[PDB]
Amino acid sequence: KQKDARELQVQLDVRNKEIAVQKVKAYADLEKAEPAIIEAQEAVSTIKKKHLDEIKSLPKPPTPVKLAMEAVCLMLGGKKLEWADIRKKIMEPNFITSIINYDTKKMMTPKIREAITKGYLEDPGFDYETVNRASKACGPLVKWATAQTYYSEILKLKQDEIVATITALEKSIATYKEEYATLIRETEQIKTESSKVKNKVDRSIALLDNLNSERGRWEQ
Number of domains in the chain: 1
Report which of 43, 39, 31, 154 is spatially closest to residue 104, judged by C-alpha positions.
31
In b/e form, how buried is each residue of 100-137, taking b as 16+ CB within 10 angstroms? eebebeebeeeebbebbbebbbebeebeeebbbebbeb
CATH number of the domain enclosing 130 = 1.20.920.20
Q: CA angle at residue 32 from 121 to 16, to 5 degrees? A: 110
Taking a C-beta distance cutoff of 8 angstroms, is the pair 116, 74 a contact?
yes
What is the spatial distance between Cα 89 and Cα 77, in angstroms, rounded to a whole number? 12
- Domain limits for position 178: 1-220
Q: How far is CA 132 from the centre of its chain?
A: 41
What is the spatial distance between Cα 142 and Cα 128, in angstroms, rounded to a whole number? 6
What is the spatial distance between Cα 208 and Cα 218, in angstroms, rounded to a whole number? 15
Method for structure elucidation:
X-ray
Which long-range CB contacts under 8 A does 70-75 form with residues at least 24 apart? 70/120, 71/116, 71/119, 71/120, 71/126, 71/141, 71/142, 71/145, 72/99, 72/138, 72/141, 72/144, 72/145, 74/112, 74/115, 74/116, 75/102, 75/106, 75/107, 75/112, 75/116, 75/145, 75/148, 75/149
